[PDB]
Amino acid sequence: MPHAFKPGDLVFAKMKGYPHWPARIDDIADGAVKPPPNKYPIFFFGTHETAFLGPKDLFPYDKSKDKYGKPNKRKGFNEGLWEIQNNPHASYS
Numbered sequence: 001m002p003h004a005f006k007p008g009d010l011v012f013a014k015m016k017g018y019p020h021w022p023a024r025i026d027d028i029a030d031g032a033v034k035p036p037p038n039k040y041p042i043f044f045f046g047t048h049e050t051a052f053l054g055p056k057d058l059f060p061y062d063k064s065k066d067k068y069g070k071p072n073k074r075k076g077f078n079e080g081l082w083e084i085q086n087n088p089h090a091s092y093s
């Protein structure tokens with residue numbers, strides 16, 4: 001059965017203006033800014049940016065990869081697809 005999102009979970013994350021984007025649930029460092037209520041730090045593969053999103057915008061990776069994993073022209077997208085498929089838990093900073 002599913003659980004609440006935890007650090008390391010792999011998703012596609014949706015933001016307005018962008019296709020569903022390969023991402024992971026990140027940890028919160030000490031003293032860093034914490035997310036708003038019921039939001040999570042989302043690390044976007046490829047672009048290597050982080051945003052706070054809620055679960056309604058987070059789609060578990062294996063269930064959604066057939067629908068959202070197709071290559072496209074957006075900057076960083078294809079590299080993000082490679083990262084989530086080949087080394088999704090590595091350090092990209």
Ligand SMILES: Nc1ccc(CNCc2cncc(Br)c2)cc1
Nearest residue numbers: 014015018021044047049050051
């Ligand atoms: N605070 C904040 C504002 C906007 C952005 C969107 N940046 C472009 C982008 C990069 N990777 C994945 C996607 Br989807 C979109 C991110 C964070």
